[PDB]
């Protein structure tokens, strides 16, 4: 009953229900009951460990806000970007605390609004600050990069003019009327509103072992048959 | 929102995808291999015990008897423990995630288009003699001419009555509404659109018609916005109470319906087999 | 958007997803996007949000337009002129501060220094700054 | 901050470098509230203080020899230090702490 | 008891298991044996008398076991969720916290009428 | 603000000798009282925690 | 009862005399030296 006892001990933990274990000693039976309780405690602890690992699913700590320490005190990990020194570098220069950190970014400024967005996809530099609309569209359409944080320096766009020209009042009135009429919402809907945007790895990276064992089961059966037949 | 908003996620489970079908065909192949090894009536018992161990050991079976069969049974049982642990972890991860839903998801929608012949007609909270009333009247009269029946006194009375349940939804300026939603006790009030506007325009310190103050005031106010004072002042004066601070009976009705349909199909198959 | 023109020069044949043709115009933007090259005047094709708003505006009161892309390619700030001690406005804003100028219309923000010399209009959008970083790749999917 | 080399070349000059931080802010606020002008200057002749040969090595020495008038910075109160020069009300709590990796 | 999920969930589950056992016995045609087997499968008791008659009844039993496992998993997940909802109360920390920066009806707080914290307070408008 | 807070000071700041920093002065300087009350007002009127 | 929240408006206790006292400097140096040689810690351990 060596095979039967071994299968019994191996399968008690798994609730296999072999039923081949009937040892003579009663002390052995009591120890087996205690050991079954121990194994169930172990499997409960394993489930708890898996639950804890799933619960702790927040390892990355990407920078948020404007005054976060990793930004107010830059390091050698990654570099920032300012996009061609226009409409943003002015804002940084005007302030003081950011101006302290401006020296580090004072030279790594890029020269376009597309070379930088390519470089992030090139994994050469990961930090960018630009207008909200452009970055939002590039995040939505290219479902590869995601931006976070809280908005600041909330100033809208605007059509331009020169000094004193006879168009200003009429153009401003017309654009306000277009806002009220609902033209802008419709246009924003059809231009930048929607572009593109038990795990399978659980039994993808595990079931291979089961499949291999199932395939080798015929080989194991042949080995056992040969062992029985030879002697 | 009248009551709590939770997602049952009956159809949002990781099932109903390619992974479940792949696992099903893999377990079918494993069962076929096990039957082949056992043969080297029992097929049905093997299928029954495999399905049980997939669910639970609560279905005893005497089909397998051997060494290699016992080995693969043990391995498959270990995989069953792994699978149930994975299901528990996935359900816990679902438990730690919650999302809410909206009500209209749009101002110019069907709900505010024909309240009469669509459910009990709604209530449109608005106040006369204001910008919003003028814009609504100038844009389309139908919604306005229906909303003219409910014109509340001011602001406090309107949402007090709405909390009492008399009204349905309020249409007003966005900034004051956001402040009130952030400030009210219990956080039982919220905008239907999560930060959604329709006719975005700013406020303004209205000067006279051409007074020689406009240039200086405009420059000074732009300087104020640029210098960062506005952000700190908004934090000091305009912040909500909660705002930034982030198995029911019907939670599995779809599973109930699917189980009933499967049972009916099994009964139909049994009747056909008895006939056949 | 900036796209190369066709052989005949008339960029066309684009219908929107809703069953409508997207309006297009002709721009004389610089040929060589790279620097240090024989810059010329390509007749490229432009179309987008800004161009649609511009067409609406042009139809609104009355005028005609000759939209041409900028020279340097930069929004416009202040920098002291080299080999001197004066200051002048570079980039796009410099074009507005000169003969070409007219009615610059593009995603140009509102500031103080800019507002000092030229006059603006009421805004047609609202934006923040929204720090952008590369999205992380989740490697935990119960694979191990 | 006075700039001096070493050896026979130690005779240097007084380069102009301007400083900022926490104590500078309270000094500026004090000057605003009391309206008195100043000519802040660093020193490189020692440290906070260490009584050597019954004489004082800078800092407290600079105050105690009537060369300066205050010593705004990161001084620490002590029995002997308060014995030789008067003090003001402490404005930040501190002491001795343990910190090992 | 299972109040955190629902008592009506309990009643509906009992009605469902009894109805399914009834129809399962009907399609085979040991009613007490079938009911005991049905209860034990949903209870891990393992009566051991279970013996399906038709393969369709076998598939019905397999589907029932799967549904029972799903129900058990859902109940355990809800119980774990309620466990992780421990300490719903939030601490009133600091003077800047909104729940204290915005007072309420009762909020019974006070101090010594002739203290020094009043001297600190009144100076702060 | 350490390099990913690899190390932390042991104990809960139980300093063996709590003394505190301070601005020194001359012996019997005329300014002593003025800056003393100025510092007291500064601490009282909510600026120290801001800094 | 519990001590939730974090401290604000920190300041010290002390001993107070009149402007004309023949002990102010002496008492201040005495309390400082007693502290620093380590007298307070014994009392805080014993009492509070």
mmCIF file with all atom_site columns, N, CA, C and O in Angstrom, chain D residues 63 68-70 85-87, chain F residues 24-35:
data_model
loop_
_atom_site.group_PDB
_atom_site.id
_atom_site.type_symbol
_atom_site.label_atom_id
_atom_site.label_alt_id
_atom_site.label_comp_id
_atom_site.label_asym_id
_atom_site.label_entity_id
_atom_site.label_seq_id
_atom_site.pdbx_PDB_ins_code
_atom_site.Cartn_x
_atom_site.Cartn_y
_atom_site.Cartn_z
_atom_site.occupancy
_atom_site.B_iso_or_equiv
_atom_site.pdbx_formal_charge
_atom_site.auth_seq_id
_atom_site.auth_comp_id
_atom_site.auth_asym_id
_atom_site.auth_atom_id
_atom_site.pdbx_PDB_model_num
ATOM 1  N N  . UNK D 1 63 ? 30.145 88.530 16.722 1.00 0.00 ? 63 UNK D N  1
ATOM 2  C CA . UNK D 1 63 ? 29.186 89.278 17.525 1.00 0.00 ? 63 UNK D CA 1
ATOM 3  C C  . UNK D 1 63 ? 29.856 89.847 18.768 1.00 0.00 ? 63 UNK D C  1
ATOM 4  O O  . UNK D 1 63 ? 29.595 90.989 19.163 1.00 0.00 ? 63 UNK D O  1
ATOM 5  N N  . UNK D 1 68 ? 29.981 92.815 14.215 1.00 0.00 ? 68 UNK D N  1
ATOM 6  C CA . UNK D 1 68 ? 28.642 92.638 13.677 1.00 0.00 ? 68 UNK D CA 1
ATOM 7  C C  . UNK D 1 68 ? 27.618 93.060 14.723 1.00 0.00 ? 68 UNK D C  1
ATOM 8  O O  . UNK D 1 68 ? 27.963 93.529 15.809 1.00 0.00 ? 68 UNK D O  1
ATOM 9  N N  . UNK D 1 69 ? 26.339 92.899 14.387 1.00 0.00 ? 69 UNK D N  1
ATOM 10 C CA . UNK D 1 69 ? 25.271 93.243 15.320 1.00 0.00 ? 69 UNK D CA 1
ATOM 11 C C  . UNK D 1 69 ? 24.257 92.124 15.523 1.00 0.00 ? 69 UNK D C  1
ATOM 12 O O  . UNK D 1 69 ? 23.627 92.056 16.593 1.00 0.00 ? 69 UNK D O  1
ATOM 13 N N  . UNK D 1 70 ? 24.056 91.211 14.572 1.00 0.00 ? 70 UNK D N  1
ATOM 14 C CA . UNK D 1 70 ? 23.294 89.994 14.820 1.00 0.00 ? 70 UNK D CA 1
ATOM 15 C C  . UNK D 1 70 ? 23.992 88.826 14.144 1.00 0.00 ? 70 UNK D C  1
ATOM 16 O O  . UNK D 1 70 ? 24.980 88.995 13.426 1.00 0.00 ? 70 UNK D O  1
ATOM 17 N N  . UNK D 1 85 ? 26.947 85.837 25.254 1.00 0.00 ? 85 UNK D N  1
ATOM 18 C CA . UNK D 1 85 ? 26.166 86.758 24.436 1.00 0.00 ? 85 UNK D CA 1
ATOM 19 C C  . UNK D 1 85 ? 24.688 86.506 24.690 1.00 0.00 ? 85 UNK D C  1
ATOM 20 O O  . UNK D 1 85 ? 24.264 85.359 24.865 1.00 0.00 ? 85 UNK D O  1
ATOM 21 N N  . UNK D 1 86 ? 23.903 87.581 24.713 1.00 0.00 ? 86 UNK D N  1
ATOM 22 C CA . UNK D 1 86 ? 22.471 87.458 24.928 1.00 0.00 ? 86 UNK D CA 1
ATOM 23 C C  . UNK D 1 86 ? 21.819 86.731 23.755 1.00 0.00 ? 86 UNK D C  1
ATOM 24 O O  . UNK D 1 86 ? 22.412 86.554 22.688 1.00 0.00 ? 86 UNK D O  1
ATOM 25 N N  . UNK D 1 87 ? 20.575 86.308 23.959 1.00 0.00 ? 87 UNK D N  1
ATOM 26 C CA . UNK D 1 87 ? 19.847 85.545 22.959 1.00 0.00 ? 87 UNK D CA 1
ATOM 27 C C  . UNK D 1 87 ? 18.480 86.173 22.722 1.00 0.00 ? 87 UNK D C  1
ATOM 28 O O  . UNK D 1 87 ? 18.125 87.195 23.316 1.00 0.00 ? 87 UNK D O  1
ATOM 29 N N  . UNK F 2 24 ? 21.136 85.093 17.736 1.00 0.00 ? 24 UNK F N  1
ATOM 30 C CA . UNK F 2 24 ? 22.001 85.648 18.765 1.00 0.00 ? 24 UNK F CA 1
ATOM 31 C C  . UNK F 2 24 ? 21.935 87.173 18.737 1.00 0.00 ? 24 UNK F C  1
ATOM 32 O O  . UNK F 2 24 ? 21.204 87.774 17.947 1.00 0.00 ? 24 UNK F O  1
ATOM 33 N N  . UNK F 2 25 ? 22.705 87.813 19.612 1.00 0.00 ? 25 UNK F N  1
ATOM 34 C CA . UNK F 2 25 ? 22.718 89.268 19.699 1.00 0.00 ? 25 UNK F CA 1
ATOM 35 C C  . UNK F 2 25 ? 23.944 89.714 20.477 1.00 0.00 ? 25 UNK F C  1
ATOM 36 O O  . UNK F 2 25 ? 24.661 88.906 21.073 1.00 0.00 ? 25 UNK F O  1
ATOM 37 N N  . UNK F 2 26 ? 24.168 91.025 20.468 1.00 0.00 ? 26 UNK F N  1
ATOM 38 C CA . UNK F 2 26 ? 25.198 91.642 21.284 1.00 0.00 ? 26 UNK F CA 1
ATOM 39 C C  . UNK F 2 26 ? 24.780 91.631 22.752 1.00 0.00 ? 26 UNK F C  1
ATOM 40 O O  . UNK F 2 26 ? 23.615 91.405 23.094 1.00 0.00 ? 26 UNK F O  1
ATOM 41 N N  . UNK F 2 27 ? 25.745 91.885 23.630 1.00 0.00 ? 27 UNK F N  1
ATOM 42 C CA . UNK F 2 27 ? 25.449 92.013 25.051 1.00 0.00 ? 27 UNK F CA 1
ATOM 43 C C  . UNK F 2 27 ? 24.774 93.354 25.307 1.00 0.00 ? 27 UNK F C  1
ATOM 44 O O  . UNK F 2 27 ? 25.376 94.410 25.087 1.00 0.00 ? 27 UNK F O  1
ATOM 45 N N  . UNK F 2 28 ? 23.527 93.310 25.765 1.00 0.00 ? 28 UNK F N  1
ATOM 46 C CA . UNK F 2 28 ? 22.790 94.531 26.044 1.00 0.00 ? 28 UNK F CA 1
ATOM 47 C C  . UNK F 2 28 ? 22.521 95.379 24.820 1.00 0.00 ? 28 UNK F C  1
ATOM 48 O O  . UNK F 2 28 ? 22.596 96.612 24.891 1.00 0.00 ? 28 UNK F O  1
ATOM 49 N N  . UNK F 2 29 ? 22.211 94.745 23.693 1.00 0.00 ? 29 UNK F N  1
ATOM 50 C CA . UNK F 2 29 ? 21.939 95.492 22.478 1.00 0.00 ? 29 UNK F CA 1
ATOM 51 C C  . UNK F 2 29 ? 20.610 96.237 22.594 1.00 0.00 ? 29 UNK F C  1
ATOM 52 O O  . UNK F 2 29 ? 19.677 95.762 23.246 1.00 0.00 ? 29 UNK F O  1
ATOM 53 N N  . UNK F 2 30 ? 20.505 97.416 21.979 1.00 0.00 ? 30 UNK F N  1
ATOM 54 C CA . UNK F 2 30 ? 19.239 98.163 22.044 1.00 0.00 ? 30 UNK F CA 1
ATOM 55 C C  . UNK F 2 30 ? 18.067 97.447 21.394 1.00 0.00 ? 30 UNK F C  1
ATOM 56 O O  . UNK F 2 30 ? 16.917 97.696 21.773 1.00 0.00 ? 30 UNK F O  1
ATOM 57 N N  . UNK F 2 31 ? 18.319 96.567 20.425 1.00 0.00 ? 31 UNK F N  1
ATOM 58 C CA . UNK F 2 31 ? 17.246 95.972 19.638 1.00 0.00 ? 31 UNK F CA 1
ATOM 59 C C  . UNK F 2 31 ? 16.581 94.775 20.306 1.00 0.00 ? 31 UNK F C  1
ATOM 60 O O  . UNK F 2 31 ? 15.589 94.273 19.767 1.00 0.00 ? 31 UNK F O  1
ATOM 61 N N  . UNK F 2 32 ? 17.091 94.314 21.450 1.00 0.00 ? 32 UNK F N  1
ATOM 62 C CA . UNK F 2 32 ? 16.713 92.997 21.960 1.00 0.00 ? 32 UNK F CA 1
ATOM 63 C C  . UNK F 2 32 ? 15.207 92.877 22.163 1.00 0.00 ? 32 UNK F C  1
ATOM 64 O O  . UNK F 2 32 ? 14.569 91.954 21.641 1.00 0.00 ? 32 UNK F O  1
ATOM 65 N N  . UNK F 2 33 ? 14.616 93.817 22.903 1.00 0.00 ? 33 UNK F N  1
ATOM 66 C CA . UNK F 2 33 ? 13.187 93.735 23.189 1.00 0.00 ? 33 UNK F CA 1
ATOM 67 C C  . UNK F 2 33 ? 12.361 93.836 21.915 1.00 0.00 ? 33 UNK F C  1
ATOM 68 O O  . UNK F 2 33 ? 11.374 93.107 21.742 1.00 0.00 ? 33 UNK F O  1
ATOM 69 N N  . UNK F 2 34 ? 12.741 94.743 21.016 1.00 0.00 ? 34 UNK F N  1
ATOM 70 C CA . UNK F 2 34 ? 11.954 94.948 19.807 1.00 0.00 ? 34 UNK F CA 1
ATOM 71 C C  . UNK F 2 34 ? 11.846 93.661 19.002 1.00 0.00 ? 34 UNK F C  1
ATOM 72 O O  . UNK F 2 34 ? 10.743 93.223 18.655 1.00 0.00 ? 34 UNK F O  1
ATOM 73 N N  . UNK F 2 35 ? 12.981 93.017 18.726 1.00 0.00 ? 35 UNK F N  1
ATOM 74 C CA . UNK F 2 35 ? 12.924 91.800 17.929 1.00 0.00 ? 35 UNK F CA 1
ATOM 75 C C  . UNK F 2 35 ? 12.334 90.649 18.729 1.00 0.00 ? 35 UNK F C  1
ATOM 76 O O  . UNK F 2 35 ? 11.747 89.732 18.148 1.00 0.00 ? 35 UNK F O  1
#
